[PDB]
Design an enzyme around this catalytic site. Structure first.
Site, mmCIF file in Angstrom:
data_model
loop_
_atom_site.group_PDB
_atom_site.id
_atom_site.type_symbol
_atom_site.label_atom_id
_atom_site.label_comp_id
_atom_site.label_asym_id
_atom_site.label_seq_id
_atom_site.Cartn_x
_atom_site.Cartn_y
_atom_site.Cartn_z
ATOM 1 N N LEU A 26 0.826 -1.049 0.118
ATOM 2 C CA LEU A 26 0.078 -0.170 0.102
ATOM 3 C C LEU A 26 0.989 1.068 0.134
ATOM 4 O O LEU A 26 0.590 2.344 -0.298
ATOM 5 C CB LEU A 26 -0.867 -0.041 1.165
ATOM 6 C CG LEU A 26 -2.079 -0.840 1.244
ATOM 7 C CD1 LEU A 26 -2.746 -0.810 2.378
ATOM 8 C CD2 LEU A 26 -2.922 -0.837 0.072
ATOM 9 N N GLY A 27 2.144 1.061 0.252
ATOM 10 C CA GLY A 27 2.976 2.181 0.362
ATOM 11 C C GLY A 27 3.424 2.762 -0.674
ATOM 12 O O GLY A 27 3.497 4.132 -0.892
ATOM 13 N N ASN A 29 1.988 2.563 -3.422
ATOM 14 C CA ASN A 29 0.632 3.194 -3.597
ATOM 15 C C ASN A 29 0.189 4.183 -3.059
ATOM 16 O O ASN A 29 -0.845 4.784 -3.258
ATOM 17 C CB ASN A 29 -0.303 2.006 -3.573
ATOM 18 C CG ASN A 29 -0.277 0.947 -4.592
ATOM 19 O OD1 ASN A 29 -0.690 0.919 -5.711
ATOM 20 N ND2 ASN A 29 0.634 -0.254 -4.454
ATOM 21 N N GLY A 30 1.028 4.843 -2.289
ATOM 22 C CA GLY A 30 0.975 6.217 -1.882
ATOM 23 C C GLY A 30 0.276 6.309 -0.646
ATOM 24 O O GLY A 30 0.427 7.388 -0.017
ATOM 25 N N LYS A 31 -0.087 5.274 -0.153
ATOM 26 C CA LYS A 31 -0.711 5.122 1.171
ATOM 27 C C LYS A 31 0.383 5.610 2.213
ATOM 28 O O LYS A 31 1.487 5.336 1.975
ATOM 29 C CB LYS A 31 -1.384 3.889 1.481
ATOM 30 C CG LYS A 31 -1.939 3.655 2.982
ATOM 31 C CD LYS A 31 -3.298 4.283 3.304
ATOM 32 C CE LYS A 31 -3.583 4.977 4.662
ATOM 33 N NZ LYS A 31 -3.533 3.908 5.633
ATOM 34 N N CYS A 94 4.520 9.439 14.337
ATOM 35 C CA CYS A 94 3.064 9.051 13.885
ATOM 36 C C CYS A 94 2.131 10.374 14.506
ATOM 37 O O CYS A 94 1.665 10.311 15.697
ATOM 38 C CB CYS A 94 2.573 7.795 14.365
ATOM 39 S SG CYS A 94 1.016 7.322 13.957
ATOM 40 N N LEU A 95 1.239 10.860 13.483
ATOM 41 C CA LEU A 95 0.588 11.919 13.756
ATOM 42 C C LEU A 95 -0.800 11.207 13.943
ATOM 43 O O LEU A 95 -1.294 10.697 12.904
ATOM 44 C CB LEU A 95 0.319 12.889 13.029
ATOM 45 C CG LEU A 95 1.824 13.738 12.857
ATOM 46 C CD1 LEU A 95 1.796 14.568 11.539
ATOM 47 C CD2 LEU A 95 2.344 14.564 14.071
ATOM 48 N N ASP A 140 2.359 23.301 -0.947
ATOM 49 C CA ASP A 140 0.899 22.369 -0.721
ATOM 50 C C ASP A 140 0.488 22.213 0.753
ATOM 51 O O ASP A 140 0.046 21.110 1.110
ATOM 52 C CB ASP A 140 1.195 20.720 -1.244
ATOM 53 C CG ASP A 140 0.193 20.019 -1.417
ATOM 54 O OD1 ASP A 140 -0.765 20.802 -1.991
ATOM 55 O OD2 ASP A 140 0.105 18.794 -0.926
#
Ligand code: PDY
Ligand code: PDY
Ligand code: PDY
Ligand code: PDY
Ligand code: PDY
Ligand code: PDY
Ligand code: PDY
Ligand code: PDY
Lengths: 287, 277, 276, 273
Positions: A26-27, A29-31, A94-95, A140
């Site tokens: 998933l990583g 893949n942008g996750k 980790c937020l 951004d």
């Protein structure tokens, strides 16, 4: 005064962190995935890029900015092999308390107040002030990239995602020093949009029938057509509206700068701004 | 209608007692006092190796010369020296010393807010002429503002056109870019100093370069405490980071603090103490 | 959604009584009157030799015609003339004269600052439509502001799109200068409206200087009773630095343009002056 | 086989006592003394703004470092400073002073020809190593020859590689101008050593006297100084670069190679200097 530089690790990240073949996939893949330290059970976030020039720039600029504690902390960077290809694996603090507006929207019926608006804007701008003081434009800064560390009531809010960041440069007037080309000023546009959403619950430019970019919406952006409608803007200062007006200026060079933003009374003395109640949390909760 | 520049070809010593060793410092880039032979009156000499930049300098400085707030060029010689073709510029001698050093030699009366304005009005007069004929000075610093004489009634003049540029190549934009505007930055800095005695940006020990880039500067107490927000706002308009946000010399010249020096209060400044010490 | 420009290719004289003399005249850039043959109703004709620039103008003018403060194109024809392809444009006939011609066919009834405001808002409306579909007129001068008629409810329309250009290729605008000179023009025209002469004027390399420099005053008598709010507004439009200038949205939202019925009815020297 | 360059990334202040009073100074060219935290032993520090120019210096200098007549690089840090990225170069500290600084302090007539030869041999050995790994220093001037300690036989060392370039990427060598710059400079220095002033100077036409290559060996100064030396200097100072001898030819030059055999006549160097 002197800050250590980025040492990209080359060992396998699964040495240090329980990364699964599942999340890892998933990583790319942008996750962005939650993983755990294996020494401590402490949790972190993993963002995965393919080693390429742009990815390198992101990590380098973000590493610089990490000094500032309103920016998400990079713990380590790995360069590993995955699926045969070489890629950067960025491990962050980790937020976990969610996105800025999610917090606000899921909290009723505790009103959001104008003063909480000001405090929140004071700390985003601190982050931007740091970035501009070292010639990075984030470029951004939107709600999706401002997240709270924890659900804890005192959680601090941090800026994320540096994949658009850019070095703003390679009696003496300021321009004499570097290019004036204006990426710093759209960080300023963005503060304007967030400030606007914070005081009412919706953006200054929008789609009616919603919600993708409208051709109506683009004209209105480009024209600079927006208003401060009742019921939601009626108790808000003219001073605040004027400030949003300076930030949402169409001509970039008419826009206020981060130093002027930070020296604005409303920003500089949040603790003096009225606790006037806002419609932000209802409007937001109403989706 | 003013006369064109005629560069004299005959040897300058035809006309001025020029030492060969003044000539030697002259080449190093020193301005030197020299004397007429008929008149035996004193002038200033700076020497340039003839090249496109120097040609540009004499040329732009010559056009600027009509403005009496600008140091006057008496004539320009093109002579052979040490084998090379090179430019010899003879000027009126500015005997008063530099803007600040004068201001710090003082104690009789108070250097007032009003003197600052009158001063800024005349540097502004110079700048306005330059820009109205499309030249940007680009090196307006204190070391380039000298007083004519030592009289109280000395007149201040701008010098050194080694960095000047033509800004030229219906709406005003249809008929330049950013050069004119750093003259106005400079006016900002000078005006700032005239009022308190120190500059708005400085090294305390890259910080300074950052602070200029960010535009971080104060109007600190004590010395700025008597200065109005009007004057503060005018300096803020000049120290604007984004060049295009800056005031133009015409607006400056029509600002009430400048346009009405007369009407500005003679309130004392700390400038002279700070500068002396 | 509105229709595209369908350029007619049949002989224009099939449709309008156009004489050879006007065609010859119209070739020389003169705008001429013609008549429909079914209807005998009256129109205006202008002739361009067909070329990419002539094609640009027609294309942009057609788009702007959507807006009623812009002269309406009624038909475009491509015909042969003197063996050259050329474009004949049929417009609504504007018959009320130029803006300042009408003001100076007044005296000695007042011409007030409030009427000034309203005229300005009217032109502003034209410019706002253009810019919002990314077109700069780039020729907003007095002789391109003609009235429909001399009836009391005649509307003021902007004409002549021969210099018009597409201004165009949580996200900033600079992502999704021509427009800014339209706004310099509003200032010029507004300035004239309130006193009866231009802010910059002939006295020519000297005048190019006064333009570049921004050199202009608000002299007396004529500006003395004029409101400071107006003078400030002109001061921004006429700014030398284009980016410093105000935008058309900011112009239409200005209290002087927005809330006319709170700009005083103070009488202006405009007609008296225009006359002399 | 020597180790490659391992640019460190941890705060230089984990290891050394780099008082922030030095950074801002060192960041614009000053070379500052610092101290190793665990040993307290002192060192020198040079700071570059991290760029390709800078990275080139550190690499070429690291390579030169094996030769003990080049000042030694202890290590190199890459750190954020004022948010800019920069290289921090830690060298052995050379505390004896600039070559000539000492010769000045000599007592009139004490410094001998034999000494000058021994020094030039010493500077010579550095140039020879550089050229033999295809590096030309390109800034061999006196303020880059510093003494290690103050001990009487403290060893002399070449510093400062900000201008160093790789002089490259039955066979004839050419089949495989920068080195020749170095040899000119050995010439000027050798010259200064023997009298106490340069071959070119002013009391500029000094740019003509170089281009024309016009210098003299004035008495009283040059009077007892041999002729084989004067002739050595006359090669090195050749106007035409290709006409100058190489570093190999210089190291084999008898005045250089056999200083032992060179007589200890006094020079006016110290006095003059
Ligand atoms: C079970 C949920 O897993 C989590 C839990 C927490 C996070 N945290 C988080 C998430 C969700 C994250 N998401 C980014 C995705 C792209 C837009 N900006 C937000 N980015 C960061 C950076 C540092 N943390 N953080 C992410 C995933
Ligand atoms: C009085 C104006 O009310 C409106 C009318 C329509 C909208 N549209 C809309 C709304 C309400 C909106 N709300 C976002 C605000 C920020 C959090 N995510 C939801 N975002 C977008 C993006 C494009 N449109 N759009 C928003 C406000
Ligand atoms: C003892 C006489 O020495 C003098 C006497 C007077 C001057 N005058 C002067 C001096 C000292 C001078 N100095 C420039 C040097 C470079 C910095 N800007 C000022 N420039 C000018 C231009 C016209 N005069 N003037 C210079 C030297
Ligand atoms: C008291 C205000 O704090 C400061 C802090 C630093 C300084 N620095 C300083 C001072 C005082 C200064 N003074 C000169 C200003 C120009 C005329 N001659 C005096 N020039 C410069 C240039 C760079 N720094 N610097 C002076 C005052
Ligand atoms: C006797 C009839 O003569 C007329 C009567 C009316 C017009 N109307 C008019 C005239 C005179 C005209 N003249 C333009 C000429 C070029 C400058 N801008 C105005 N343009 C337009 C556009 C639409 N109508 N219109 C022109 C000539
Ligand atoms: C108080 C200054 O009075 C003057 C003196 C001279 C002028 N010149 C002039 C005047 C008087 C002028 N007057 C009107 C001509 C008709 C259109 N509206 C302006 N138009 C132009 C165009 C170019 N110059 N110019 C204008 C005003
Ligand atoms: C601040 C303490 O004082 C010292 C004491 C010793 C040094 N040593 C030294 C100094 C002074 C130094 N100075 C360079 C400065 C630029 C010219 N070349 C020599 N370079 C080097 C290289 C290795 N050491 N070293 C420098 C400063
Ligand atoms: C017999 C001639 O004696 C002279 C007369 C004048 C000079 N000039 C001078 C001398 C004396 C000189 N001496 C330095 C040589 C290097 C060490 N520091 C002193 N360096 C320079 C550089 C440019 N000129 N210059 C040198 C020698």
């Amino acid at each position: 005064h002197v800050k250590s530089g980025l040492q990209i690790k080359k060992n396998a990240i699964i040495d240090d962190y329980k990364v699964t073949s599942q999340v890892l996939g998933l990583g790319i893949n942008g996750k962005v995935l939650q993983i755990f330290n294996k020494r401590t059970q402490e949790k972190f976030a993993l963002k995965m890029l393919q080693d390429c020039p742009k990815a390198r720039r992101e990590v380098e600029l973000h590493w610089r900015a990490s000094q500032c504690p309103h920016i998400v902390r990079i713990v380590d960077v790995y360069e590993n092999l995955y699926a045969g290809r070489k890629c950067l694996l960025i491990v962050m603090e980790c937020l976990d308390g969610g996105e800025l507006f999610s917090r606000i929207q899921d909290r009723g019926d505790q009103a959001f107040t104008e003063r909480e608006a000001s405090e929140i804007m004071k700390s985003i701008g601190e982050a931007i002030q740091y970035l501009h003081s070292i010639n990075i434009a984030h470029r951004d800064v939107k709600p999706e990239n401002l997240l709270y560390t924890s659900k804890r009531p005192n959680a601090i809010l941090k800026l994320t995602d540096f994949g658009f960041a850019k070095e703003t440069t390679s009696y003496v007037a300021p321009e004499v020093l570097g290019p004036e080309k204006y990426d710093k000023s759209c960080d300023m546009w963005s503060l304007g949009v967030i400030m606007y959403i914070l005081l009412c619950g919706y953006p200054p430019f929008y789609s009616n029938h919603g919600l993708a970019i409208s051709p109506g919406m683009k004209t209105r952006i480009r024209m600079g057509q927006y208003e401060f409608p009742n019921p939601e803007w009626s108790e808000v200062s003219e001073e605040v509206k004027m400030l949003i007006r300076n930030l949402l200026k169409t001509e970039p060079t008419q826009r206020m700068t981060i130093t002027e933003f930070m020296n604005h009374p409303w920003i500089m003395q949040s603790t003096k701004v009225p606790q006037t109640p806002l419609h932000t949390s209802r409007v937001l909760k109403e989706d």
